[PDB]
Amino acid sequence: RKQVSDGVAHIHASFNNTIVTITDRQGNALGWATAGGSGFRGSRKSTPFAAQVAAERCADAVKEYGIKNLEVMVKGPGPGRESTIRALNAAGFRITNITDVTPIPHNGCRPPKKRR
Amino acid sequence: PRRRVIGQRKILPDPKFGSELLAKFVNILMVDGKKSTAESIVYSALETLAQRSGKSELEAFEVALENVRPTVEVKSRRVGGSTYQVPVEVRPVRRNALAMRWIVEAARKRGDKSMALRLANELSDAAENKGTAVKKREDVHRMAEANKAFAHYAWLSLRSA
Amino acid sequence: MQLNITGNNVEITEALREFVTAKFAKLEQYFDRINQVYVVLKVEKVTHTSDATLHVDGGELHASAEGQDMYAAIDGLIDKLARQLTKHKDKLKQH
Amino acid sequence: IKVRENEPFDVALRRFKRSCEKAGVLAEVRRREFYEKPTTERKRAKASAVKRHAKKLARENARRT
Amino acid sequence: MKRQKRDRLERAHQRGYQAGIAGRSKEMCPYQTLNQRSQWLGGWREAMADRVVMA
RNA sequence: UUGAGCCUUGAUGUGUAGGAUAGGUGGGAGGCUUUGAAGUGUGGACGCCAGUCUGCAUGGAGCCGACCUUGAAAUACCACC
RNA sequence: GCUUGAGUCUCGUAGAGGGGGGUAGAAUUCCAGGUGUAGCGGUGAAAUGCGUAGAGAUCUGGAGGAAUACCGGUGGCGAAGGCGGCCCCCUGGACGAAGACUGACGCUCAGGUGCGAAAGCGUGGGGAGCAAACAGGAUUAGAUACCCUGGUAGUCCACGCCGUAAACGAUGUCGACUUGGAGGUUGUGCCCUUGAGGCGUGGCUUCCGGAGCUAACGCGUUAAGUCGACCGCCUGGGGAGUACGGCCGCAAGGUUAAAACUCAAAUGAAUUGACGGGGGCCCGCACAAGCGGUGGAGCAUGUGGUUUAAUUCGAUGCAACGCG
RNA sequence: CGCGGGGUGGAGCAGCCUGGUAGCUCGUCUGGCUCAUAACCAGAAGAUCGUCGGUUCAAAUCCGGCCCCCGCAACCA
């Protein structure tokens, strides 16, 4: 429980799901909540609203660590990614800075061939 | 339709009480094109709603109505293979008519002896938050609030009022 | 799926009804749930023609085939109906 | 991308630069190596560019409105 | 049998919004008059954001 | 670092009823306190979110028991656990 | 003999031109460790799959392989195939300015020789990611498929082979001549570089259009216009780029290349319709919002069938079936 | 042949590591959805907690006896 002050809020924002991992400055996790585990299932995981409910259900169950202010990292080009940080302005936090950690390779490995 | 915000006509108010909502309510259970016996059912039911409720009749009907009027209503949509329901807000003209349709259907169920006794008891439990139309109200709110995660494109309820 | 046979100037023999019924049943089983089928046999002095109307959940669908001996016309009509059914079937799958 | 500033901040600037270069390169790279149709899609894109420029230029005569 | 609905003004809006969402990044199927082209393009640019928020 | 066992201690034990986060059994109107009182500068635990423990006062000399509700009367006090 | 064609030399200029070597960053995967716990992943929906043996996420470190975001430009170089991080070494070609030099040394080229994407084959390494075959889950009437979860050859390197591609500009090479415009890129000359300025000049290249040509589509100074030199190829469609024989190849197969038979067509371009599970716009009890029905029942009436001596004849998708 | 553990919806099991009211997925039943089946979603009943006893106010929970399992053994007449 550790009585931490500030945290780093990683938001993995893929197409089929958003998971929200609130950690500390150090980089080791304090609590996470996903858009799947909030009652939304299958296609309904892939909405911004499930990301908002995920950010709520993380922002409490990190209450016991006592975080006043947090940074926001967002990885992934998904349908959440903005409603989930409106849901961290509204959850009672002070947003220090917001970054983008979406991995853009200087094209390396080959992508899959997926669609027809 | 495609065209025509249609030239709309109003209705006659109720004779015994100064209400057009009540006249709409007579027109709901006015089955088979026969207004007079539906008026006798409504008056015969609001009398025993007054004696079985104490308070006045117009406020008895309206307080009994606002516990079955809804706020959100599902609209079934399909995109691709899925066919999910999307919550639209009910407009307040459709609201009370959608309440009275559920009151009148739930009174056509429930079967007691007379229609005025059935509708009188159904409005009584609608005041009590107990009967059938409150269960249908809570079904509509549970599935629209359960499917609440859809607020989208253009096929429903443009910007505001 | 009940098949109704009728004939304008074509005397529907019992061997004729057995074959047509079998062919229709086979087609119905292969492509879609079908509710009812009307078959009309016409002879116009040369042309042995056949009409069929299938009532399926989506709706009516019809085909017509001219032949030489009635049997040929029936076969053509059945193949046409099968093709139409494939179109209607995944026309209402379209995932 | 990186937004930090004083008390009116945090949304518009970020969804601007984030949304443009992020959604561009990730929505591109998410699948389809293709090896062949960036050539075709750039050829069609730029032929449509010169056809739109000359088409609007000679379409700048009149429209009877 | 009555008169046209929202006389092309905010019908021109929702045509540009549906055409905005379903691809059509032309912005080159509008009307030609100004009061309808302005919000065909208005619905188009209001539909680009609603394409970013979803798939 | 860490179990496990053993002592010495110290907290904890809101069903219902209700003045109340009363564990059981037995004894049981005597200790508390100016070895500087109820409130709180204070700081936590527990927390079945309502009440109990202890840290330091700037105050300073006060509190319950039998007598109201309970299958039950009070960590009022003590013993065995 | 001559210098205009061709070639050489002195300066530069740009360039993913080639071969070899080295190195950098991001990302993917895995491994070890930390924090943390109930899901992750995936789809049009799902399941197979992975996860309480601690996954997914997050952080630190390490390993290995492959490709080089941005710059990136209907930009550049190359005979074509093709060639994109950055640096070094070795090396080919093109271009232009000013001169000098040789003096027709030129063009094309059957046979021949060389180069030749990808797949594949042989030997030896290497193997991240992807991914035929294959397994499984779906979908479907079936689904040896598209979709999903995995996954081996191969993709990579070194050395040989194969020698084909919609190897395409579906346009052989070389040369001459013949109205314009807008651009790109790359040199260079003069003048007020006095200001990203103005006027010319070469090369390569993109589009639009003139006459002319073409069956039309379209081509149009980079021609499919007017001509000249040389070469390759065609002679109805199918059989057939197949068989037999030769030559090459480890094989797969490549090249050369028939005939019997059979048909009166096959084809190219354009037109008018019709059609599309193409697009745009508008509308309809078309859907949505509702009210009442049919289908269950009895009866009436009509039809099919069956019957009969006859059950008169016709009407049969919508548009026949209380119809004449 | 004596030790342990289990008896709770149809089934799998939580509850009972401190006595106060029976709980979750499926199967089974509606309803919405779908062209119908499906998938999704929202509700509902589904048990005298294996049977007799008793231990205090009150026992699925604590303790005896019986039955049924599953393991450990003892298994050298």
mmCIF file of N, CA, C and O (backbone and C1' of nucleotides) in Angstrom, chain C residues 5 8 17 30-31 40 42 51 53 62 87 89-91 95, chain G residues 44 139-142 277 304-306 315-318 320-321:
data_model
loop_
_atom_site.group_PDB
_atom_site.id
_atom_site.type_symbol
_atom_site.label_atom_id
_atom_site.label_comp_id
_atom_site.label_asym_id
_atom_site.label_seq_id
_atom_site.Cartn_x
_atom_site.Cartn_y
_atom_site.Cartn_z
ATOM 1 N N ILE C 5 -48.502 -29.529 -57.765
ATOM 2 C CA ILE C 5 -48.318 -29.700 -59.200
ATOM 3 C C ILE C 5 -49.622 -29.360 -59.907
ATOM 4 O O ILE C 5 -50.707 -29.751 -59.467
ATOM 5 N N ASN C 8 -51.339 -27.325 -67.461
ATOM 6 C CA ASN C 8 -52.173 -26.814 -68.545
ATOM 7 C C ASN C 8 -51.824 -27.639 -69.778
ATOM 8 O O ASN C 8 -50.706 -27.574 -70.289
ATOM 9 N N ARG C 17 -45.272 -37.179 -61.642
ATOM 10 C CA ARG C 17 -45.297 -36.566 -60.316
ATOM 11 C C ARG C 17 -44.226 -37.161 -59.406
ATOM 12 O O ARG C 17 -43.678 -36.450 -58.551
ATOM 13 N N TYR C 30 -30.905 -29.302 -50.158
ATOM 14 C CA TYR C 30 -29.593 -28.704 -50.440
ATOM 15 C C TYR C 30 -29.349 -27.199 -50.186
ATOM 16 O O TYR C 30 -28.292 -26.832 -49.677
ATOM 17 N N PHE C 31 -30.303 -26.332 -50.530
ATOM 18 C CA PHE C 31 -30.086 -24.885 -50.375
ATOM 19 C C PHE C 31 -30.702 -24.059 -49.223
ATOM 20 O O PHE C 31 -29.971 -23.323 -48.560
ATOM 21 N N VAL C 40 -46.107 -25.467 -62.373
ATOM 22 C CA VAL C 40 -47.066 -25.360 -63.463
ATOM 23 C C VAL C 40 -46.423 -25.930 -64.713
ATOM 24 O O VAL C 40 -45.309 -25.542 -65.075
ATOM 25 N N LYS C 42 -46.889 -26.353 -68.776
ATOM 26 C CA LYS C 42 -47.621 -25.884 -69.941
ATOM 27 C C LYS C 42 -47.072 -26.539 -71.194
ATOM 28 O O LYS C 42 -45.867 -26.752 -71.324
ATOM 29 N N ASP C 51 -43.156 -23.647 -65.051
ATOM 30 C CA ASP C 51 -43.034 -22.534 -64.131
ATOM 31 C C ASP C 51 -42.934 -23.096 -62.727
ATOM 32 O O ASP C 51 -43.518 -24.141 -62.434
ATOM 33 N N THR C 53 -42.873 -21.496 -58.515
ATOM 34 C CA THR C 53 -42.891 -20.392 -57.561
ATOM 35 C C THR C 53 -42.581 -20.991 -56.196
ATOM 36 O O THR C 53 -43.330 -21.828 -55.687
ATOM 37 N N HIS C 62 -39.282 -17.055 -58.472
ATOM 38 C CA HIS C 62 -39.932 -17.736 -59.578
ATOM 39 C C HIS C 62 -38.913 -18.086 -60.651
ATOM 40 O O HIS C 62 -37.921 -17.380 -60.827
ATOM 41 N N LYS C 87 -28.342 -17.235 -54.314
ATOM 42 C CA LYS C 87 -28.380 -15.769 -54.308
ATOM 43 C C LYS C 87 -29.215 -15.236 -53.157
ATOM 44 O O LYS C 87 -28.798 -14.311 -52.454
ATOM 45 N N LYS C 89 -30.108 -16.984 -50.391
ATOM 46 C CA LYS C 89 -29.567 -17.495 -49.134
ATOM 47 C C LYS C 89 -28.481 -16.590 -48.580
ATOM 48 O O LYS C 89 -28.631 -16.020 -47.495
ATOM 49 N N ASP C 90 -27.389 -16.414 -49.321
ATOM 50 C CA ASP C 90 -26.350 -15.582 -48.726
ATOM 51 C C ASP C 90 -26.612 -14.095 -48.936
ATOM 52 O O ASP C 90 -25.946 -13.265 -48.303
ATOM 53 N N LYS C 91 -27.591 -13.761 -49.786
ATOM 54 C CA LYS C 91 -28.173 -12.423 -49.794
ATOM 55 C C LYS C 91 -28.772 -12.073 -48.438
ATOM 56 O O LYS C 91 -28.736 -10.913 -48.016
ATOM 57 N N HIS C 95 -22.944 -11.424 -43.791
ATOM 58 C CA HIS C 95 -22.350 -11.055 -42.502
ATOM 59 C C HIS C 95 -21.325 -9.922 -42.542
ATOM 60 O O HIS C 95 -20.808 -9.573 -43.602
ATOM 61 P P G G 44 -13.947 -8.755 -38.481
ATOM 62 O "O5'" G G 44 -15.444 -8.521 -38.016
ATOM 63 C "C5'" G G 44 -16.310 -7.663 -38.732
ATOM 64 C "C4'" G G 44 -17.746 -8.026 -38.472
ATOM 65 C "C3'" G G 44 -18.033 -8.668 -37.128
ATOM 66 O "O3'" G G 44 -18.156 -7.707 -36.099
ATOM 67 C "C1'" G G 44 -19.198 -9.802 -38.860
ATOM 68 P P U G 139 -20.511 -21.563 -36.772
ATOM 69 O "O5'" U G 139 -20.729 -20.866 -38.182
ATOM 70 C "C5'" U G 139 -20.293 -19.538 -38.413
ATOM 71 C "C4'" U G 139 -19.968 -19.326 -39.863
ATOM 72 C "C3'" U G 139 -20.909 -19.994 -40.838
ATOM 73 O "O3'" U G 139 -22.112 -19.276 -41.015
ATOM 74 C "C1'" U G 139 -18.681 -20.340 -41.524
ATOM 75 P P U G 140 -23.503 -20.060 -41.008
ATOM 76 O "O5'" U G 140 -23.435 -20.971 -42.304
ATOM 77 C "C5'" U G 140 -23.437 -20.394 -43.596
ATOM 78 C "C4'" U G 140 -23.131 -21.420 -44.648
ATOM 79 C "C3'" U G 140 -24.007 -22.657 -44.636
ATOM 80 O "O3'" U G 140 -25.269 -22.455 -45.244
ATOM 81 C "C1'" U G 140 -21.744 -23.292 -44.838
ATOM 82 P P A G 141 -26.580 -23.136 -44.616
ATOM 83 O "O5'" A G 141 -26.260 -24.693 -44.657
ATOM 84 C "C5'" A G 141 -27.216 -25.653 -44.238
ATOM 85 C "C4'" A G 141 -26.981 -26.976 -44.915
ATOM 86 C "C3'" A G 141 -25.524 -27.375 -45.062
ATOM 87 O "O3'" A G 141 -25.060 -28.066 -43.918
ATOM 88 C "C1'" A G 141 -26.659 -27.649 -47.130
ATOM 89 P P G G 142 -23.649 -27.699 -43.258
ATOM 90 O "O5'" G G 142 -22.591 -28.262 -44.302
ATOM 91 C "C5'" G G 142 -22.476 -29.659 -44.508
ATOM 92 C "C4'" G G 142 -21.648 -29.979 -45.724
ATOM 93 C "C3'" G G 142 -20.304 -29.286 -45.816
ATOM 94 O "O3'" G G 142 -19.311 -29.954 -45.063
ATOM 95 C "C1'" G G 142 -21.419 -29.152 -47.899
ATOM 96 P P G G 277 -26.999 -5.549 -56.326
ATOM 97 O "O5'" G G 277 -26.667 -6.301 -54.966
ATOM 98 C "C5'" G G 277 -25.856 -5.690 -53.978
ATOM 99 C "C4'" G G 277 -24.832 -6.652 -53.438
ATOM 100 C "C3'" G G 277 -23.622 -6.909 -54.317
ATOM 101 O "O3'" G G 277 -22.645 -5.890 -54.184
ATOM 102 C "C1'" G G 277 -24.457 -8.956 -53.453
ATOM 103 P P G G 304 -59.311 -27.109 -61.117
ATOM 104 O "O5'" G G 304 -58.069 -27.849 -60.450
ATOM 105 C "C5'" G G 304 -56.740 -27.429 -60.707
ATOM 106 C "C4'" G G 304 -55.760 -28.096 -59.774
ATOM 107 C "C3'" G G 304 -55.798 -29.609 -59.735
ATOM 108 O "O3'" G G 304 -55.128 -30.211 -60.820
ATOM 109 C "C1'" G G 304 -55.723 -28.786 -57.539
ATOM 110 P P G G 305 -55.761 -31.506 -61.513
ATOM 111 O "O5'" G G 305 -55.747 -32.611 -60.363
ATOM 112 C "C5'" G G 305 -54.562 -33.331 -60.062
ATOM 113 C "C4'" G G 305 -54.638 -34.013 -58.719
ATOM 114 C "C3'" G G 305 -55.476 -35.279 -58.653
ATOM 115 O "O3'" G G 305 -54.762 -36.425 -59.074
ATOM 116 C "C1'" G G 305 -56.074 -33.857 -56.880
ATOM 117 P P U G 306 -55.402 -37.420 -60.151
ATOM 118 O "O5'" U G 306 -56.427 -38.296 -59.309
ATOM 119 C "C5'" U G 306 -55.979 -39.116 -58.244
ATOM 120 C "C4'" U G 306 -57.101 -39.443 -57.293
ATOM 121 C "C3'" U G 306 -58.330 -40.090 -57.909
ATOM 122 O "O3'" U G 306 -58.208 -41.477 -58.147
ATOM 123 C "C1'" U G 306 -59.009 -38.321 -56.520
ATOM 124 P P A G 315 -57.199 -21.556 -70.011
ATOM 125 O "O5'" A G 315 -57.491 -20.422 -68.938
ATOM 126 C "C5'" A G 315 -57.591 -19.059 -69.312
ATOM 127 C "C4'" A G 315 -57.788 -18.186 -68.105
ATOM 128 C "C3'" A G 315 -56.714 -18.312 -67.043
ATOM 129 O "O3'" A G 315 -55.607 -17.479 -67.313
ATOM 130 C "C1'" A G 315 -58.836 -18.504 -66.037
ATOM 131 P P U G 316 -54.150 -18.117 -67.455
ATOM 132 O "O5'" U G 316 -53.841 -18.629 -65.987
ATOM 133 C "C5'" U G 316 -53.328 -17.741 -65.005
ATOM 134 C "C4'" U G 316 -52.366 -18.430 -64.071
ATOM 135 C "C3'" U G 316 -51.259 -19.243 -64.736
ATOM 136 O "O3'" U G 316 -50.073 -19.132 -63.965
ATOM 137 C "C1'" U G 316 -52.518 -20.633 -63.303
ATOM 138 P P G G 317 -48.982 -18.015 -64.311
ATOM 139 O "O5'" G G 317 -48.688 -17.352 -62.900
ATOM 140 C "C5'" G G 317 -48.873 -18.090 -61.704
ATOM 141 C "C4'" G G 317 -48.250 -17.378 -60.538
ATOM 142 C "C3'" G G 317 -48.598 -15.904 -60.422
ATOM 143 O "O3'" G G 317 -49.801 -15.699 -59.710
ATOM 144 C "C1'" G G 317 -46.257 -16.223 -60.172
ATOM 145 P P C G 318 -50.764 -14.478 -60.082
ATOM 146 O "O5'" C G 318 -49.999 -13.207 -59.522
ATOM 147 C "C5'" C G 318 -49.848 -13.002 -58.128
ATOM 148 C "C4'" C G 318 -48.863 -11.897 -57.864
ATOM 149 C "C3'" C G 318 -49.199 -10.560 -58.497
ATOM 150 O "O3'" C G 318 -50.097 -9.807 -57.699
ATOM 151 C "C1'" C G 318 -46.926 -11.121 -58.923
ATOM 152 P P A G 320 -55.181 -11.927 -62.647
ATOM 153 O "O5'" A G 320 -55.115 -12.974 -61.449
ATOM 154 C "C5'" A G 320 -54.538 -14.259 -61.622
ATOM 155 C "C4'" A G 320 -55.575 -15.334 -61.813
ATOM 156 C "C3'" A G 320 -56.380 -15.727 -60.587
ATOM 157 O "O3'" A G 320 -57.466 -14.861 -60.314
ATOM 158 C "C1'" A G 320 -55.572 -17.665 -61.623
ATOM 159 P P C G 321 -57.875 -14.536 -58.796
ATOM 160 O "O5'" C G 321 -58.207 -15.954 -58.165
ATOM 161 C "C5'" C G 321 -59.429 -16.606 -58.455
ATOM 162 C "C4'" C G 321 -59.462 -17.973 -57.834
ATOM 163 C "C3'" C G 321 -59.548 -18.004 -56.326
ATOM 164 O "O3'" C G 321 -60.851 -17.773 -55.845
ATOM 165 C "C1'" C G 321 -57.910 -19.535 -57.050
#
